[PDB]
Amino acid sequence: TGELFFRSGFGIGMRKDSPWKQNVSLSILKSHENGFMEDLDKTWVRYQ
């Protein structure tokens, strides 16, 4: 019930000295724009 409040998305926790920033951001963008996220949603949302 009700409406969404304090709408904030999730994220991947990292560290300031970790050199895996771009290599993870590009993977996330690939998953988003290549339908991987859509497939995961379809396989994990709207069960009934």
Partner 1 sequence: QRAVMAVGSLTINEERSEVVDFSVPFVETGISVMVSRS
Partner 2 sequence: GMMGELLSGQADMIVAPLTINNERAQYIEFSKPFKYQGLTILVKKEIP
Ligand X SMILES: Cc1sc2nc(COc3ccc(F)cc3)cc(=O)n2c1[C@@H]1C[C@H]1CO
**With binding defined as CB under 8 A, does residue 26 bind partner 1?**
yes
Query: If you search the block for the tokens 């590009």, which residue do you land on?
Result: 26
Q: How far is the CB of 27 from ligand X (least distance, A)?
A: 12
**With binding defined as CB under 6 A, does residue 8 bind ligand X?**
yes
**With binding defined as CB under 8 A, does residue 19 bind partner 2?**
no
**With binding defined as CB under 8 A, does residue 11 bind partner 2?**
yes
Considering only residues 9, 17, 22, 23, which one is a binding residue for ligand X as defined by CB under 6 A?
9
Main-chain dihedrals φ then ψ at residue 24, nearest 5 degrees: -90, -40
Reported as type and span, the H/E element at residue 36 is: helix 36-44
Spatial distance between the Cα atoms of 24 and 21, rounded to a whole number of angstroms: 5
